[PDB]
Write a protein that binds this ligand. Structure first.
Ligand SMILES: CCCCCCCCCCCCCCCCCC(=O)OC[C@H](COP(=O)(O)OCCN)OC(=O)CCCCCCCCCCCCCCCCC
Ligand SMILES: CC(=O)N[C@@H]1[C@@H](O)[C@H](O)[C@@H](CO)O[C@H]1O
Ligand SMILES: CC(=O)N[C@@H]1[C@@H](O)[C@H](O)[C@@H](CO)O[C@H]1O
Ligand SMILES: CC(=O)N[C@@H]1[C@@H](O)[C@H](O)[C@@H](CO)O[C@H]1O
Lengths: 220, 1181, 225
């Protein structure tokens, strides 16, 4: 079993520049005869994955001129020169020795390098129809942030709670290239009315103070 | 010419067409059976490829590793053992199909040749006699056997191979398209070139049976004429001149043979270069196609070998079609002779058959001309009557129109104008068989048929009893001597049996005529060739045969013709005078003039013959060893490429590796080319030098050997030209091409064995029990492809004796009406080879089919055992394919090579012949140079009691106590009866023979002490029939005196004294006129005068004249006598006298009987002696 | 010209058996190995196994020994994976890939199918429950205001959501499905200016085909209690 490690997992890039990715083994990929086998693959969403670079430095019949690949021993690197508006997807690595198990690598998406931005927050308590049904759910929205990493944290009466969590992140927007997430927790009708202080925290890299947003049950 | 192809099978019949149809169907469903097994081979090697590749992929199966790999190879085991059933199925199929094709084709061939041969002989024996004496019986003798064998090998077997070849081609081509698409087009683009390679290459692989006889023809003609004229050669010396002319022709033939051999070798080398270039770039394109993932390996093997075998199968078809068309020309000749309509049969059943024939004969206004020259008339307005039982004698001018009488009464020719009638009925209105049955002939020269005396008699009539034979022999005065013969009536006579005298033969012919009981008797110069003693008893027998029969006699010498009833003298085809003897003598016309003018192998010696040029053998044998161990090299690199397509690795190393192997293909092609060229070159030139020197030396030693060797009937002209030509052509091979092929095959198969025993261990022990039967397959397949095993021809040659013996003695058998006897006897000795050919057909078919089936069986057996070997992980597929290729292609190579060079038996016995006669030392060495050779130009001749027997028949004596002297300048005459020994004197003074006892002296010196060439130099022979060589007048005359400048001045004087100067000066291109078969034809007397001039140039002091009966020139004869008398004026002369006019003027006469001199003296003395010589002169009265 | 194809998406209940197909087009089908590979959502890429695609010789991995079976059909140039003993932990996207048999192990995989999604379930068809999402009672702080709509429960995918029957699409965010207790949950929201609500009409519009419910839900301002 030849495990592998790839970095970086999610990297940004501008338009028409250079972008490099690195793949590292744990064994030695150098075969007895003088060869080292890698097979860099491109994958767009929905369509089928293509072949891009095989045997480290060579190319494949029908690829553009912008792709290079170099490395040695147990460390390899692919280089993109002049990134167009078409090479946006998931790149993934390959390996040499057959069974077992002839395994692959993780994958790396591509980001368009936007200027940083702090998210916008919103809170939504359940509705009287939802309370009438019996089960009710608290909702927190966050919008228009960058980059993709974010830390949501739920507290009830200033106390942690790690169950019934629902999280969802959108994909990359086409126009302005921002992000958005939404979280929701589900409770029964009795334990809801017990407590008032309900808060969502949004910890992000653009500031030191987490965005704390709370509410109680009664005030308007 | 054509026939054409529709009329070739004109004598088919009821059911042989069924054999044709079923046979061609069998050929079609036989030829298609070879490409499909190549398809199966592609599939099975694809199976091995996939299994080996998958198991070679995964190998780190730890732990619990054994069971799934063994399951993979279990799939291999079963998926391989399914195909052996396919292989053995097509094995059984090809077995029975091949059997039926070969058997049926050859059977139809036999059943057609039988009919066509009997009808051909029936056609020849039923012919107008005028169609003979025009087409040369010698050619027509060989035409039947040679040409019908030529059509036999052309209509029967070869076209079956042609059909199955075309079927193989279309099968391979369609199986190429249905499995591959692109690669068939590139192999087809290359296809015509290697098709030409294999085609013309097989054209030259064939024969090499008598192509070297074509460019040899000139020296063969010189040899046959000099060996047909040895009697006039050895008497004039001339060994050096004829030897040098033969040397010139032989040298030119040698040079052209060298050139043709070099060109053929170039052709074959280019064939190899092209075929290996084809393999090279074909596998190049195949590899660069498969590495892109288009085809597989099974497809490229299948389609490539399929189209390759298609091209080969096209290349092996041209000899069949050329032999077919050659048989078409042969069929034009034969069917022309068959389809003729002879107008004067002589076999038909149309005319009358009148009984009680009285014999009134009549010629009425007869105008005739022989069909050779219609312009000259022989008979013009001939009118003659012959009353019943009467005897008429026709005499006059020779050649005028006498023998035409006999040849018209038999209705051998029709007369143009006029009418020949018997008893008032036209001869053209009666049945010709019954005509010739009521007539008996007695030809000039008596013939006998090479059978018993009995069969010679009841050739007179088949249904004759033995008592009738005795009575008929008693009437012909032939009984008493036949009872003296060893085997009485069963004594074998003819060309084969004991020789009889002329009179005995003529009396047997009389007996043949007598039992026929004819009403009319014809005698065509019944006794010109017989002497004076043999003629008396024959005349008694003839007078007994004339009693009660109507008789017409055409004969010279008007002696006993005196007792005839009526005479007729011819002059220009017209009877000028007619009456009784006393009446024409009183007429003083033509008759009176004639009457008054009268009155072990030893192989070391076989190789030691070629001790002169051993370096050619050294370099050739080295490059033959190199060309032997370079057949398995192809096998091993083939195994390496097919194997490197059955493993797992980096693609780039695979591509580069295969590229290297392909260029190695091409390199091996180059090396094969150059070594093949110079190998064939040096062996060919060694063979040519060997045959030139050997043929030269054998011709020399034949010229050295004496005359007694030329009477053994196994030593004849054709026998000896056949011996030197054929035996040199065979001995060239037993040292020429055997070493190359034996070293090539041992190097090939030994390299295969060793390169097997290195890699594979098990399978070779199995295949060593497989190599013998496929080794047999090679040589038997080459027997059936070359057709050499078909030509045995033993009982055929035991039967053709009666064919030759009936065709060259034609006039007598057609004048005795024997055609049913000879066809009936020609049925049996022909029907035995009929059944023999049947048995041979069946056994040959079953043998060929069996060996094909065993091939296709052991194929499957070997691959299944090889599948078990690769099953337990102890042998790679490369190795099984390598050892299979090595052993199998080695056996195919030894089959293809082991029967391209000639055989062994006839070669080594031909060497036995050649060394036996080149070691044969002559008793009387002419080529010797010792001897007295004095300066004495006298010419005193003296025989002293010579005792001699011809060593061919040492039982009969010829000379015993013969003594006689000849003084200088005078003339000695030798006369006597038959078997007296007069002609032996000329042959003993020439020293053609030595006497057992006694001595022969020249100028008081024994000739055994003299140089033989000198002795023969001062002798001028003048043979009976003068032989003339195919060249100009000047050269034939100069051939008399040899080793001399001989200028223009010296020729004309000799031509003058021979009395041919005046006749030559009017000939086209006077003395430069070429004489022979091409140039002008001179009369017999003129030939004799040329011989006289040839004797005159030598200027000898002794002159030997060996002349005799008869004489028809009536104009050239007297001029010959003028030249003869001119030559004898101042020279010692010995004359073999048969004409009574020349002997009366000789200075001394010797009468010989039983080798003893009975009496001697001048003409006047021996005339007054009233003894033997007086009896000879009284006959011409 | 070379192309692989696979079937359509799959919704399969628990414990049954299913069959998936990979069809080849445009090359020599008798050479190449076929490799079956797996991909869960948010993990690496596993390895189902491979077959020879010429005679049916198979090979598996240890993790999947007995949960699959491979077959081929040469008359129509097609490969099949039969998949039995199906459980929940196999809802994923499966890929089929090509490999040259003549020099494998040292050469990459050439081409890939578009991939099939197989979802494993255990519940039955269920109608949704559509809930509105209005803000907390208070003052309009900023000009930008956001309104939301939940869709809770339903099965199976998909559901089509619009705003005012697709009147506007400015600031629309549609999160993908979230799974819990073999049931689904989806949310959406939108943001406009303060001079829009409640001065205009905003209505979430849900369409579910399998239940054939085309339900309108209009939001309302939140009451005090
Ligand atoms: C460690 C071991 C190393 C061994 C190294 C030494 C290798 C020895 C083998 C060298 C090759 C053998 C050379 C044979 C020479 C044959 C020459 C020849 O002329 O063959 C011709 C013959 C038929 O051709 P044909 O046209 O008819 O000839 C004209 C006849 N008028 O064609 C034939 O019929 C020839 C058939 C002979 C082949 C049969 C024997 C094969 C040799 C293997 C022996 C084992 C097989 C026998 C097994 C039983 C033995 C008990
Ligand atoms: C248990 C076993 O056989 N493991 C082998 C290992 O020993 C070898 O070092 C490696 C080299 O390819 O392949 C695997
Ligand atoms: C299923 C089986 O038999 N596996 C055996 C394993 O139990 C053993 O521990 C190992 C030690 O060599 O070899 C293998
Ligand atoms: C024909 C054959 O050998 N099949 C074997 C099977 O018996 C074995 O149980 C398995 C290993 O677990 O691999 C496979």
């Amino acid at each position: 079993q030849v495990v592998m490690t790839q970095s970086p997992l999610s990297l940004p890039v501008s338009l028409g520049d250079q972008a490099s990715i690195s793949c590292r083994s744990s064994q030695s990929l150098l075969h007895s005869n003088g060869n080292t086998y890698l097979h860099w693959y491109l994958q767009k969403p929905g369509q089928s994955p293509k072949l891009l670079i095989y045997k480290v430095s060579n190319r494949f019949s029908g690829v553009p001129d912008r792709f290079s690949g170099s490395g040695s021993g147990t460390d390899f690197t692919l280089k993109i020169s002049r990134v167009e508006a078409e090479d946006l997807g998931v790149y993934f690595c390959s390996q040499s020795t057959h069974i077992p198990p002839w395994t692959f690598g993780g994958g790396t998406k591509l980001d368009i390098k936007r200027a940083d931005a702090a998210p916008t927050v919103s809170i939504f308590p359940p509705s009287s129809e939802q309370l009438t049904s019996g089960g009710l759910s608290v909702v927190c929205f966050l919008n228009n942030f960058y980059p993709k990493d974010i830390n949501v944290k739920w507290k009830i009466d200033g106390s942690e709670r790690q169950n019934g969590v629902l999280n969802s992140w959108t994909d990359q927007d086409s126009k302005d290239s921002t992000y958005s997430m939404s979280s929701t927790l589900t409770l029964t009708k009795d334990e809801y009315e017990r407590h008032n202080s309900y808060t969502c925290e949004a910890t992000h890299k653009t500031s030191t103070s987490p965005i704390v947003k709370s509410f109680n049950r009664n005030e308007c | 010419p054509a026939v054409s192809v529709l009329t070739m099978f004109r004598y088919a019949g009821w059911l042989d067409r069924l054999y044709m149809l079923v046979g061609t169907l069998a050929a079609i469903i036989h030829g298609v059976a070879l490409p499909l097994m190549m398809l199966i081979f592609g599939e099975m090697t694809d199976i091995f490829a996939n299994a080996g590749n998958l198991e070679d992929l995964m190998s780190n199966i730890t732990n619990r590793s054994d069971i799934n790999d063994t399951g993979f190879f279990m799939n291999l085991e079963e998926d391989m053992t399914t195909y052996a059933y396919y292989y053995t199925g097509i094995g059984a199929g090809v077995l029975i199909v091949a059997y039926i094709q070969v058997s049926f084709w050859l059977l139809a061939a036999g059943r057609q040749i039988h009919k066509i041969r009997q009808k051909f002989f029936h056609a020849i024996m039923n012919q107008e006699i005028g169609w003979f004496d025009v087409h040369d019986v010698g050619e027509l003798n060989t035409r039947l056997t040679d040409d019908v064998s030529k059509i036999n090998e052309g209509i029967g077997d070869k076209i079956g191979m042609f059909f199955q070849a075309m079927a193989t081609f279309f099968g391979g081509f369609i199986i190429g398209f249905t499995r591959g698409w692109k690669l068939t087009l590139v192999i087809l683009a290359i296809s015509p070139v290697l098709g030409l390679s294999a085609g013309i290459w097989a054209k030259i692989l064939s024969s090499f049976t008598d192509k070297e006889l074509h460019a040899y023809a000139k020296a063969g003609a010189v040899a046959e004429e000099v060996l047909a004229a040895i009697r006039t050669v050895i008497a004039f010396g001339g060994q050096k001149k004829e030897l040098e002319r033969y040397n010139n022709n032989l040298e030119e033939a040698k040079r052209l043979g060298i050139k043709k051999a070099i060109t053929a070798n170039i052709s074959m080398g280019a064939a190899f270069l092209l075929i290996y270039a084809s393999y090279a770039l074909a596998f190049w394109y195949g590899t660069t196609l498969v590495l892109s993932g288009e085809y597989s390996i099974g497809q490229v093997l299948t389609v490539f070998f399929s189209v390759l075998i298609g091209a080969f199968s096209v290349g092996q078809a041209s000899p069949n079609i050329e032999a077919f068309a050659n048989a078409r020309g042969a069929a034009y000749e034969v069917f022309k002779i068959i389809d003729n309509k002879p107008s004067i049969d002589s076999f038909s059943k149309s005319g009358h058959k009148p009984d009680n024939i009285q014999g009134n004969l009549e010629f009425k206004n007869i105008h005739f001309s022989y069909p050779s020259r219609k312009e000259v008339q022989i008979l013009k307005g001939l009118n003659l009557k012959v009353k019943s039982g009467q005897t008429v004698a026709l005499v006059g001018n020779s050649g005028a129109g006498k023998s035409t009488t006999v040849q018209l009464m038999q209705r051998l020719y029709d007369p143009l104008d006029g009418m020949v009638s018997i008893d008032g009925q036209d001869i053209r209105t009666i049945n010709v068989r019954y005509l010739r049955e009521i007539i008996g002939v007695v030809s000039q020269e008596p013939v006998l048929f090479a059978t018993t005396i009995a069969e010679n008699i009841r050739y007179g009539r088949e249904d004759v009893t033995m008592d009738e034979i005795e009575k008929a022999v008693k009437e012909a005065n032939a009984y008493d001597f036949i009872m003296k013969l060893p085997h009485q009536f069963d004594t074998l006579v003819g060309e084969r049996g004991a020789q009889l005298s002329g009179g005995q033969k003529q009396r047997i012919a009389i007996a043949r005529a007598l039992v026929r009981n004819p009403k009319i008797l014809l005698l065509d110069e019944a006794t010109c060739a017989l002497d004076t003693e043999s003629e008396a008893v024959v005349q008694a027998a003839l007078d007994k045969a004339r009693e009660g029969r109507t008789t017409i006699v055409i004969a010279h010498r008007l002696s006993t013709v005196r007792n005839a009833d009526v005479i007729a003298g011819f002059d220009g085809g017209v009877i000028v005078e007619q009456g009784n003897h006393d009446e024409l003598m009183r007429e003083k016309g033509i008759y009176f003039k004639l009457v008054m003018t009268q009155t072990p192998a030893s192989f070391w010696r076989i190789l030691k013959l070629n001790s002169t040029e051993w370096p050619y053998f050294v370099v050739g044998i080295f490059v033959a060893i190199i060309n032997g161990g370079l057949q398995p090299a192809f096998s091993v690199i083939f195994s390496k490429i097919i194997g490197v397509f059955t493993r797992i690795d980096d693609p780039e190393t695979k591509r580069q590796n295969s590229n290297l192997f392909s260029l190695l293909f091409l390199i091996l092609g180059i090396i094969s080319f150059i070594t093949f060229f110079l190998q064939g070159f040096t062996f060919g030139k060694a063979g040519e030098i060997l045959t030139k020197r050997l043929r030269y030396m054998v011709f020399k030693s034949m010229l050295r050997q004496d005359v007694s060797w030329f009477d053994d009937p196994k030593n004849t002209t054709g026998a000896l030209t056949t011996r030197l030509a054929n035996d040199a052509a065979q001995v060239k091979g037993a040292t020429g091409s055997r070493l190359a092929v034996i070293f090539q095959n041992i190097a090939n198969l030994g390299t295969g064995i060793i390169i097997s025993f290195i890699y594979g261990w098990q399978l070779t022990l199995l295949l060593l029990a497989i190599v013998p039967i496929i080794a047999i397959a090679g040589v038997v397949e080459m027997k059936m492809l070359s057709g050499q095993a078909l030509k045995d021809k033993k009982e055929l040659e035991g039967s053709g004796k009666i064919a030759t013996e009936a065709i060259e003695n034609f006039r007598t058998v057609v004048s005795l009406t024997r055609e049913q006897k000879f066809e009936t006897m020609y049925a049996q000795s022909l029907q035995i080879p009929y059944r023999n050919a049947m048995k041979k057909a069946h056994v040959f078919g079953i043998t060929f089919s069996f060996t094909q089936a065993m091939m296709y069986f052991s194929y499957a057996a070997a691959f299944r055992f090889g599948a078990y070997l690769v099953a337990h992980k102890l042998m790679s597929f490369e190795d099984v394919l390598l050892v299979f290729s090595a052993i199998v292609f080695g056996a195919m190579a030894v089959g293809q090579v082991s029967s391209f060079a000639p055989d062994y038996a006839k070669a080594t016995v031909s060497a036995s012949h050649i060394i036996r006669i080149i070691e044969k030392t002559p008793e009387i060495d002419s080529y010797s140079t010792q001897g007295l050779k004095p300066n004495m130009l006298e010419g005193n001749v003296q025989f002293s009691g010579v005792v001699f027997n011809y060593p061919t028949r040492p039982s009969i004596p010829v000379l015993q106590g013969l003594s006689l002297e000849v003084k200088k300048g005078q003339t000695l005459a030798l006369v006597g009866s038959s078997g007296a020994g007069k002609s032996t004197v000329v042959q003993l003074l020439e020293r053609f023979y030595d006497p057992m006892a006694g001595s022969v002296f020249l100028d008081g010196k024994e000739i055994k002490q003299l140089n033989v060439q000198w002795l023969r130099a001062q002798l001028g022979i003048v043979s009976q029939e003068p032989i003339l060589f195919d060249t100009s007048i000047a050269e034939n005359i100069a051939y008399g005196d040899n080793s001399r400048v001989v200028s223009y001045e010296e020729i004309v004087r000799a031509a003058k004294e021979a009395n041919i100067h005046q006749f030559i000066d009017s000939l086209p291109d006077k003395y430069n006129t070429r004489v022979g078969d091409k140039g002008t034809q001179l009369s017999g007397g003129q030939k004799q005068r040329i011989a006289i001039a040839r004797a005159l140039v030598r200027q000898p002091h002794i002159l030997l004249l060996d002349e005799a009966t008869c004489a028809l020139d009536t104009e050239s004869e007297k001029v010959v006598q003028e030249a003869l008398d001119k030559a004898r004026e101042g020279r010692t002369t010995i004359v073999i006298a048969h004409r009574l006019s020349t002997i009366q003027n000789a200075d001394l006469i010797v009468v010989i009987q039983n080798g003893k001199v009975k009496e001697h003296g001048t003409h006047q003395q021996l005339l007054a002696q009233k003894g033997i010589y007086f009896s000879m002169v009284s006959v011409q009265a | 010209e070379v192309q692989l194809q696979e079937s359509g998406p799959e919704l399969v209940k628990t414990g049954a058996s299913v069959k998936i197909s990979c069809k080849a087009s445009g090359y020599s089908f008798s050479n190449y190995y076929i490799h079956w590979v797996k991909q869960s959502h948010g993990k690496s890429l596993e390895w189902i196994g491979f077959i020879s695609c010429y005679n049916g010789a198979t090979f598996y991995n240890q993790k999947f020994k007995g949960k699959a079976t491979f077959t081929v059909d040469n008359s129509s140039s097609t490969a099949y994976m039969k998949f039995n003993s199906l459980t929940f932990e196999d809802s994923a996207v499966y890929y089929c890939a090509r490999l040259p048999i003549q020099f494998g192990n040292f050469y990459p995989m050439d081409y890939w199918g578009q991939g099939t999604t197989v979802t494993v379930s255990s519940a039955k068809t269920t109608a949704p429950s559509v809930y509105p999402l209005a803000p907390v009672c208070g003052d309009t702080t900023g000009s930008s205001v956001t309104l939301g709509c939940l869709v809770k429960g339903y099965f199976p995918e998909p559901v089509t959501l619009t705003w005012n029957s697709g009147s506007l699409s400015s600031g629309v965010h549609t999160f993908p499905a979230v799974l819990q207790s073999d049931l689904y949950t989806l949310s959406s929201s939108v943001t406009v200016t303060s001079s829009t609500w409640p001065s205009q009409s905003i209505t979430c519009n849900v369409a579910h085909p399998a239940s054939s419910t085309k339900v309108d839900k209009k939001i309302e301002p939140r009451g005090p209690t």
